[PDB]
Design a protein around this ligand. Structure first.
Ligand SMILES: CCCCCCCCCCC(CCCCCCCCCC)(CO[C@@H]1O[C@H](CO)[C@@H](O[C@H]2O[C@H](CO)[C@@H](O)[C@H](O)[C@H]2O)[C@H](O)[C@@H]1O)CO[C@@H]1O[C@H](CO)[C@@H](O[C@H]2O[C@H](CO)[C@@H](O)[C@H](O)[C@H]2O)[C@H](O)[C@H]1O
Lengths: 246, 34, 246, 246, 246, 45, 218
């Protein structure tokens, strides 16, 4: 897991549970079976109706993009593109093929393959930008599942509470327990709001943050391959690519 | 969304309102039988 | 009709009804005549007032799009367009005309007809894009009906609470009348939120998801036809069109 | 510290605290520990889950930009560019290399270096604009942390309230002393809405305002460097650059 | 004070106060010290935190733009440029200097000076357009202060309402002191909505209307100056420039 | 969205109303009049 | 629940006040014409009298347009009549398009300005409804002596909110929408006249004028 998510979950549990215990309570009074089944079951139902089945199989991959550690290999590639620049300058474009064959980055490998095949500069720009646009769209689709789960969850909490209160309207005759009865009913709304705000919308926001980092790295590889095709000098190549790395 | 809190707040307030408008109504009814 | 919707409806029914029955409800307790008539009758009335009658006839077509099973044909059309591009490199354009004369995809057929007629490349783009935006507008109009039904249904819940509040302020002669009157407030609220959130807004969301898939297939066919007009070699065509598929 | 922020915080405290006290409440009624812990602890948790760790370390820098005293040096630079331009015209471009070595503005220094190295005008514009775009993106990322904190804080106020109502309605056996109990629950909503609106969304707004001012200084050094390359007469350069300054 | 604003304020006061007095009331009721301090104090705080101090000094100048009378001289200049067009025809462009030697409009005076110096058409266009963009940006910044105050003012009202609900629940145990506290809720709503939608959000709209009138006058002086450089015959100039006047 | 920030405010006003109506109903005629009159002074004349 | 006097004087009075503060008086005096365009006959005749313009295409080039100026004295429309005077000796292709094209932009801006008054009125009116309701509830806070009025008095206060929401949605936003939609139709008729004037310079093919003009008609 990401260290920020681990510390965030620790802080979140201490805030909510510690707050409840400080005003006075038991944690066993904050757990309900039926409220969990209505809120989570209802959210899951609304998401499954909302999306085709193939999207839901992407949901596993969505969490892997969010919680993955930051490998941060961008710097390594910035060097390589600079080095390819120097090879292209002395040796000619055929040497770029032999340099690139076994590079662990596919997008870079394909970009260089288009330049060694001698394609004209607007065409290599067009094909590589279509790959970037496809990755932008893919990551947005993962995030949208979690954003939509976060918008149904609070309303499912309301359905939960109103179902609780309908049962209580059958026991209004006993005034002593009406009060404790209403409290148990409210538990569902606490789940609806709390799950949306802590779990669902944070996972969506973290997906969108990590997508933006990865798209920058792709755009650098795009300016890198167009720069080596233009035949810029190594100092100018380094200066352009440096604008991307933070 | 910025204003996502108001959706839940208007739901909670509404439930509260129903409770007092039900009590108020009971208080008049009790005062009538008393 | 469709698998993700079917599992969603099963999960939704089990969550809401199972939650109520676990804490000792009875299913007849959720049904109320006047609450049903205000929320469902009022939603139907609001849609019929707000939209012209021909739009309501599109509602059948909207559901037909939403629960259309997954179609694999994009792979086949990629192969077709690559084969056609290979013929365009080797052969006279007349071979395209005779090959595509009886092709099942109308949009692709018309694009090729325009390239055989030798029509100007920006005009070919323009007329094809006018058909794409016409199809996008048709699907958006279906979705908007369901989004409006999702807006009206909660407001009919508010009207239900107002009717409940009027009855309880107006008419009590014994406290027993309390429950049978305030019942209308709660049950109308439940139908408003539950119908909007599970039925209406999911069907809207699924229409928009399926529309986006169909538009991507049209965009791929457009880029295929423009590649054939430019005269690109088959391997490069294969790469571009493949970016659209995932 | 910045004087408009300081007077704004004094006015904010007087509005909320003075508004409460003037009708005969108490600071001891207003200041609630458990409500503070659930709203602030919950906001911190949601932001930590929402962002990677490296972005949270940018928070220090974000506040430093928001409260930067505006000791404007923009006017000082306009002189530097104008005098540099007339040196370039009379002496030849080599003189700029001797002159612009100690200069504290790195963006201007690199602009001049690109012109000295004889690079083409569209390339100079491209590289300089990439550095402007990088700084615009950096300042947007700072603002987004505060905008997201301001979104979560009101919803945490709802969690603190509903948890408060769970405790009170739970230990109620009859309708006595309920009013004071329920009142304290609403204090958590008050901290959520009041902190978001005065502290969080203003600091977001101020970061975006001061970003825009800094970008205009860079855009001027862009027209300064391009006019130095063109070799316009000093009066014309002074005219253009003045359009940027207020 | 423009005539429209004076009649608008009279209509506003007569509608609101006349409505209240007619149905029965006393005007001393609609002043609530605490409500004023929450709504106006809070709005002042939020705006001061949001903007640097230099912007707030511009706020006076924003009102001066909103309420200046329409002593439009656009018609005057539509003659001036056309004249100068004739003088350029039957005399050298050098003569233009004496005709524009002194003019109330700086924009016109300078524009012609750049044509007298003999500067090229695309550069004279660019310098003139930079002055127009600077004027548009200045007027937008005035409007933004008023729009922002209009945004915070209703949200300060809801903070005041929550403070009202807290205080009224506090007095349930002894219901004998709720007279003042009951109002602070209602009157804080009234100040929030009324100030936003009668004072702030209008004055924003008037600033944007009057900026658009001034920008159109500058766009005319630009088209006039370029026509004077081109040396068009007077009838063509008069036709074109007139299209700007309404 | 102005409606939400208003329909939130307007609904809160109604709750404040009834919270007052309930509390007054738990009081006798004597203290009822003092409050009922006291208010009746500021918003009528 | 009819014509509550106070509600009308607070919803309509307040909407009028907000609009008068919002716009300079010269804009407010254009309201008359805004209504005229919003409620006016279909008047698609020009679209069908395109044949009148196309009659000109062959005839204008068939013999000298020297009689054309007197010939087009009749007003098919001003833009058309004015355009012919320019299309007469004295205009290069770019300039004649530019001067005529500018007229089109000026008319588009004029119609948008009318619509914006109604859009803004429909934005202030619903909020003013709220001001009316809150003043109603304040007046009820005064007269709390009786226990039956606690019902009807709250109901009448809400009538002020309805007069807002209802006025905004039915009166104001439809008048805005119908102004802007018919402006877009009238702009197309302009574009028709522009293609007529450009084709009058370009040649003398009656059927060819038909082809170009037909594209603009839809
Ligand atoms: C945040 C909201 C949650 C709060 C919790 C909810 C309610 C909290 C308690 C309020 C409340 C129940 C609610 C009723 C409807 C509201 C439902 C709302 C829920 C909606 C989902 C209980 O309140 C009771 O009544 C009085 C209220 O103060 C009070 O009377 C005393 O103290 C006074 C002090 O000034 C003082 O004058 C004096 O010493 C007493 O007069 C009692 O001590 C108190 O126990 C209302 O009271 C009602 O009283 C009725 C007569 O008993 C009772 O009628 C039923 O039972 C009768 C004999 O059993 C039987 O003869 C009736 O035939 C039967 O019909 C009602 O059922 C109801 O109980």
């Amino acid at each position: 897991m990401d260290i920020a998510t681990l510390i965030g979950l620790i802080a979140g549990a201490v805030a909510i549970i510690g707050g409840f215990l400080w005003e006075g309570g038991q944690i066993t009074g904050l757990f309900q079976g039926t409220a969990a089944l209505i809120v989570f079951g209802g959210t899951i139902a609304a998401v499954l109706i909302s999306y085709p089945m193939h999207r839901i199989r992407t949901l596993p991959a969505g969490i892997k993009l969010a919680f993955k550690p930051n490998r941060s290999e961008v710097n390594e590639w910035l060097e390589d593109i600079v080095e390819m620049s120097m090879v292209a300058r002395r040796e000619g474009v055929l040497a770029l093929e032999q340099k690139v064959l076994d590079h662990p980055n596919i997008f870079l490998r394909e970009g260089i393959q288009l330049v060694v095949d001698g394609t004209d500069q607007p065409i290599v720009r067009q094909i590589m930008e279509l790959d970037i646009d496809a990755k932008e769209q893919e990551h947005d689709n993962y995030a949208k599942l979690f954003e939509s789960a976060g918008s149904y969850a609070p309303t499912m909490g309301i359905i939960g509470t109103v179902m609780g209160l309908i049962q209580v309207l059958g026991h209004l005759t006993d005034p002593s327990q009406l009060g404790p009865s209403i409290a148990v009913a409210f538990i569902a709304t606490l789940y609806g709001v709390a799950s949306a705000n802590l779990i669902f919308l944070p996972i969506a926001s973290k997906i969108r943050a990590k997508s933006a980092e990865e798209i920058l790295v792709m755009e650098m590889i795009l300016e890198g391959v167009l720069s080596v095709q233009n035949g810029d000098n190594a100092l100018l190549v380094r200066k352009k690519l440096n604008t991307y790395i933070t | 969304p910025h204003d996502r809190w108001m959706i839940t707040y208007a739901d909670l307030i509404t439930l509260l309102l129903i409770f007092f408008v039900m009590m108020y109504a009971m208080s008049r009814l009790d005062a009538s039988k008393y």
